[PDB]
């Protein structure tokens, strides 16, 4: 009843509408905000976008290994 | 290490993960089409690769 | 001449200072203040502190793989 | 996974080196005297392994 990865959620979306628009699926993108009923703002900062910089980081650590 | 293209190539079947889990499935059709994604098409259990490791780092940094 | 990993560096050392004085390290803490000529202010979070937090996920992520 | 135990052992290893690579040995001795480290002492490049991922981690969430 009382979330705890409220914020992490959010930003998640904000962060994949972000990829969305920035991968050319505009479409995708629109979609997906209706889908979610999304009532927050959208601020989306400088390119490249947060999720893909995020990934580019997760994506180097998980294929490392000990 | 890992090449530029394989971690893009993962990051939008995991996003397309995404969006069929948190469900956006119209989106997630959309968006394979919107990138031209020819390639087998898996996914796993919900929420998904992409969602378990975006909110155990968030909280780190929180 | 213009850091760019700044903020990264100063935070590590906060952090680490924190974990030396969790694991019962205190005279490491202290010395290692001294050493680095820290002129901050050490506010330290709840406990457990964020560098053994963070350790444990970049940890769990290190050791998966595809 | 990776069990608590070895993810402790590898934390305090990973501190040693970051110790000694920021310039604060006298802290890194102190530090292996404190927790009683027995093991074997070995480390690699500066700045070493937590000061590498560390600061890369720290960028993305800025």
Known sequence: AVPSDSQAREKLALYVYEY??????????????????????????????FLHSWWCVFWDLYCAAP
């Open 20 to 49: 969305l628009l920035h991968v050319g699926a505009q479409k995708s993108a629109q979609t997906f905000l209706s889908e979610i009923r999304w009532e927050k703002n959208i601020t989306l900062g400088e390119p490249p976008g």
